[PDB]
Symmetry: C4
Subunit: 283 residues, 4 copies
């Protein structure tokens, strides 16, 4: 497989610590992110502790020269707790308190907004069919796959972009992976609530015209699907990607109706039937 | 009705606690959201209270072994109030204070940003006409519905996507709901301030060409409308959806002019006339 | 004038307190917004003051029954200042402190995020020419207007949508304002840095084909311009709107080159020349 | 060069302090931004210090008339530290504390949200080839340039807009820079993971049809590239711009394959080969 089932590439890649700070703060794992924020919080409070000590004995009820007492006073100042046992003395420590309160209020507000950004990533909650089918629709062979909304809230302006990716030999003897846009009957669904079957009519303008299971395997053909939409639950845009290889196309298959009948005779959506494909079996 | 008047589906659906945390935090009711935040706030302060107690008697002016005194000290630390009656003693409680201040400052900032997200959902403030009409416009039968901006602020790049949804029998005997895009005379209005009448000319390319009130009812025809736009009041995008059934089309009707004359002879917008449709009555 | 110079409508409009809370919190004036936030802050602290008093004398160093002492203790609790002169006594006041700290931390965080939203509205910083011109370009009469970027930072994917708005009589004797999209030579400028002249070639497909200054005045013709783009300074989308009446079209005029020569022989942009139009004067 | 390599213009520009506050707060340098926030923090605390003094001796444990003691009490109130040595006396200072806590909580929250906005600007992390090439592709001369994703995370709905910018003489003897959209074989790549070669087939509809290296230099031809896309790492849109002059087009050159073979026989992406162009050398 060139592309994984999720649509990402398998190709190995090659060719400063804070050179991409924002990206790294978002993509780094939660234990790493936590260590970074917690360590920065502790390192800043250790730097102010040393600063208070460099002024002399400028913290009331603190043991002279005690870093521990200066650190805990710094925490009480930076977090703006201010119990009042450890309190600043003179213009030097009060100036440092004024600087530290500002750093803590600003820096902890930024750290908290970064936690929120990492936490509020919306997921499309869209299910792609495990396979694609090739069967006749309106008297023409048609490539199909389907999507379902896994949530109760609607996706507005839902778009699907289907692309064929195959190996080709150019007119000047150049071997390369080419990307062919597959024209869909409907690429935009204004309101996506339940199930959507995406169709590519295989006409003389289709890059898979006259193609068989065998010819798709020789060009190492792959089908890449991008779904985009605005999700009403999040009041944000969402996307989902997927990839099918040549062996995931059921030639002559048709998708089973997902709309089932409940015991009370009601019409329901059964996503148990979502990956079910019907085929004709010969002797 | 397959689709409700708001554009949602009526179909019954089937086929972990924190498996969709962000969606559930946004879509859950306000009393439930409040119980969750308040309970998490109280449970965290109860966990730190127990932690302070596990260290021994490390809170000044607290009754030894008192959970109540340890809980209220935890609240005073986590909220960063720090009155100074209940104060930490030793390296163990001061370390817990340092950890608790961080959790509270970060966690309460995230909870507050989540309240803001739930509170700042923009509404389009767009009124859809209670009916659609079918009457001649520029010598051609035309399907129409109308929208009005209920607010003083404008919607920029306003888009309308009108779709017919009917039951159909495919060439291979497949019964299914098909979605037909209805081509509008104008689908984009760069600046939407007052009233907008949306028109679908019923020409030989229209899916409702040669269709009558009777034929629309036999295919269980429905009309789905999606409105999108950028709202100047919110400096955010907005949308609105609506649905009409076959019995909500006034055949031969025309919308009444909404621009009324005020006593001072001034031209005004009267949204009292917005749902008024004029029809010819025969003997 | 039907439409003002800024693109808004002049039409008079007609046809619950917290029924549109979010819109009203954004569009209300700053003195009103401030009164609302400040009053809510003061009313909440007065409600907790009364609550503390209803428990009895549960505030140390407070005068029994004093609302003033209970109010200032509430402020010290809700703002999380906690000096430590006024401190809570018993399980009742400590429970109220726990509730009040939560309300204040959450509610003041939301109020502050609302101030930021009202404060960070981006302006396009785009100058529209005071007039439009009609003159020959590539041997065809062309309608033109121009825009300039007033800032050093670029606007990416800049779009212009020009529309004619005139009064018309329909085939069934209906008088109405019709919106005609005016097709531009270029409606998209990927990178907008300096000046952009927008052109509508008046060909047989133009709604202003065969139109004169006189015929535009009889239909009360107006030209509405919408500019949209992504601003690099804000890393946000921006828009600007404008409107021209029939008397703001210079028939036969051409815009003066804005690129001037500086004393050091350097080529500069002179936005002093931006509204300058050249015309031929006859005897 | 009219346009720099980054796509910005070189043209010199000409033609109130808080007249563009939000833009200036985002585009101003970090030392300037810090001085502004820090100075505003210090000036506000100096104004409350003076206010407390104007009431008389209304701060316990403060030296009468001492601005230093009133300033540090103001810092302790505005930051909500509240140690409890300097505490307010009477209805006048307690009213000022109530006002100051509100200002500090709101104003410091806004300042912190502004730091976050300045800090969380996403970069596309896209590499443009140092040159463009003109060589035959599918038996037609084709203009090409290429882009690579410098990060592991994908860009979804990646768009490329290529424009020619040359000096031209109009039919009425007008010399001006004209912007020609160059039609690409593929302008949209739904999922951009590795390398993308952008192609403009030079057919009879191309503005560079029949053009040579010499004719492109006489019109001072430049090629402007805009890349846009949605970045999965940031869950935000991104863009990148670039510009090529006439001397940056390798006539007859073709880009070298970036997909290299690793010692374990694995296929890898070598961005060391990204700027490598192959050419035929004659005697
Ligand atoms: Cl925020
Ligand atoms: Cl935000
Ligand atoms: Cl096709
Ligand atoms: Cl049609
Ligand atoms: Cl035209
Ligand atoms: Cl072309
Ligand atoms: K505090
Ligand atoms: K405090
Ligand atoms: K305190
Ligand atoms: K205290
Ligand atoms: K805070
Ligand atoms: K104290």
């Amino acid at each position: 497989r060139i592309l994984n089932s999720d649509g990402s590439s398998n190709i190995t890649r090659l060719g400063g610590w804070l050179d991409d700070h924002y990206h790294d703060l978002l993509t780094v794992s939660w234990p790493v992110f936590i260590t970074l924020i917690t360590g920065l919080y502790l390192v800043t409070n250790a730097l102010f502790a040393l600063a208070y000590l460099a002024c002399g004995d400028v913290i009331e009820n603190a043991r002279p020269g005690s870093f521990t007492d200066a650190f805990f006073f710094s925490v009480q100042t930076m977090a703006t707790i201010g119990y009042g046992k450890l309190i600043p003395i003179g213009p030097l420590a009060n100036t440092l308190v004024t600087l530290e309160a500002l750093c803590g209020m600003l820096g902890l507000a930024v750290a908290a907004r970064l936690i929120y950004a990492r936490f509020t990533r919306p997921t499309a909650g869209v299910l792609f069919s495990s396979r694609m089918v090739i069967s006749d629709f309106e008297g023409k062979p048609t490539l199909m796959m389907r999507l379902a909304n896994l949530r109760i809230e609607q996706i507005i302006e839902a778009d699907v972009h289907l692309v064929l990716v195959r190996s080709e030999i150019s007119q000047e003897g150049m071997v390369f992976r080419r990307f062919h846009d597959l024209t869909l009957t409907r690429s935009r669904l204004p309101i996506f609530s339940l199930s959507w079957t995406v169709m590519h009519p295989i006409d003389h303008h289709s890059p898979i015209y006259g193609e068989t299971d065998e010819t798709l395997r020789n060009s190492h053909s792959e089908f890449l699907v991008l779904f985009t939409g605005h999700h009403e639950a999040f009041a944000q845009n969402v996307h989902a990607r997927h990839a099918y290889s040549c062996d995931e196309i059921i030639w002559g298959g048709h998708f089973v109706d997902v709309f089932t009948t409940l015991p009370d005779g009601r019409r329901a959506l059964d996503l148990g039937k979502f990956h079910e494909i019907a085929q004709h079996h010969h002797h």
